[PDB]
Amino acid sequence: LKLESVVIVSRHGVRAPTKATQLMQDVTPDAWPTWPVKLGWLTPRGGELIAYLGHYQRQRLVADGLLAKKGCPQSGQVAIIADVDERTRKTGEAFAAGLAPDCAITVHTQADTSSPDPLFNPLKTGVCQLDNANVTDAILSRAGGSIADFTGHRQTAFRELERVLNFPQSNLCLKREKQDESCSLTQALPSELKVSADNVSLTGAVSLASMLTEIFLLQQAQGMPEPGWGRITDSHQWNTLLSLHNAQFYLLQRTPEVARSRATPLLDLIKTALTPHPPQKQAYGVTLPTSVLFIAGHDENLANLGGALELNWTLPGQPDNTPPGGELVFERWRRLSDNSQWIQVSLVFQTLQQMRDKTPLSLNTPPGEVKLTLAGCEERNAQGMCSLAGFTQIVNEARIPACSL
Ligand code: NI
């Protein structure tokens, strides 16, 4: 096999929390550690972890014969697209700095950076709408029939989060006691599914827990001295904590009734980058197809793509299934025996310890990687890849044309 093309859909790197709410204060007697950047911004350490991934990808793509060992990629051989958020733009630059240092590869965004880019979520600008009833029933079914069923099967992990928070000594709990009580997160903050034409979310403990366990993970990856006030001490605890974050993404972002719509512009972009065709300037002034395309997005995007293309995974050593800097990697491979075209999909990521130790990455110290398979592919090769035609058929089935740009 010979590597012809690669599209990397990446989550942004380590960032500060996006919000600092009263409820976050009320559920723990302890003080949340402060962060060195504004809310939701990439930290400098976050960018350094992304550059490690970019350096590794250069070494890997050189070894695969797609990029030259020395010099800068010439004229669009590498292209970078990023969401308008600071954290995604800065992730773009960090990846370029690791992959091709001092080559000044442009980080393209949409023209207006003060407005949402529908590429990373067409619901957000009203390009299309979700089907309310179908989404409600689909999500509730994946939760086990109800959100009460969902949280009941997860009390062990909610109890883990309460211990790390010292929830019993929190303001919320102390009040509950003066008031007949139930000092449990799930019952103090009942969770409801809210489905609108442009969004779905959970209220209450489910969404609070998804956010708090992710913050814990970000503290660890940021190198903070004692994440979770020092109360997270082994990998079992880390996995149990982030299972609440992963479960919320399983419901809200992997569900096909949400994922297929939300992922349609990215699906179109991916297919455009991977399909052989006379090179032509398309979205963002980027010429496609080309050799490497890096797209700096969000964890909803990785989850959306996973849900739409029936790609299932868990990340060994990385409690967050859609971690900072995690990469959904699409590759087009040409089989020399008959010159047929094949698509390979992988999830490339830093383990939590590689982020904790700021481990420089290389061929001899690679990031983790999980081989994926498109569950619906009818034509696979011995190595698990889907034929170009099979992948194209799968994409055309999964995408929602009303959600296209
Ligand atoms: Ni995630």
Author numbering: 6 to 410
Authors' text:
AppA, the Escherichia coli periplasmic phytase of clade 2 of the histidine phosphatase (HP2) family, has been well-characterized and successfully engineered for use as an animal feed supplement. The E. Coli periplasmic phytase, AppA, is a 1D-6-phytase (EC 3.1.3.2) and initial hydrolysis preferentially liberates the phosphate at the 1D-6-position on the inositol ring. The catalytic proton donor is found in a second, short, conserved motif with sequence HD positioned such that the aspartic acid residue functions as the consensus proton donor in the catalytic mechanism.
KM also decreased for the AppA-HDE mutant while its turnover number is reduced to ~17% of the wild-type enzyme. Only AppA-HDE showed an increase in stereospecificity, decreasing the production of InsP5 [1/3-OH] to only 6% of total InsP5. On the contrary, the variant AppA-HDE becomes more stereospecific than the wild type while reducing the accumulation of the 1D-myo-Ins(2,3,4,5)P4 intermediate. At residue position 305, the T305E substitution found in the AppA-HDE and -HAE variants results in sidechain χ1 angles of 46° and 65°, respectively, for the glutamate residue. Thus, in the AppA-HAE and -HDE variants the E305 sidechain points away from the substrate and towards the active site cavity. AppA-HDE has slightly enlarged pockets A and B due to the loss of the side-chain methyl group of T305, whereas the double mutant AppA-HAE has larger pockets A and B with an overall change in polarity. For both variants, pocket F decreases in size and its polarity increases by virtue of introduction of the larger sidechain of and carboxyl group of glutamate. In particular, active site comparisons suggest that an enlargement of specificity pocket B allows accommodation of multiple InsS6 binding poses (e.g., for AppA-HET), while the decrease in size of pocket F by the substitution T305E (e.g., AppA-HDE) leads to an enhancement of stereospecificity.
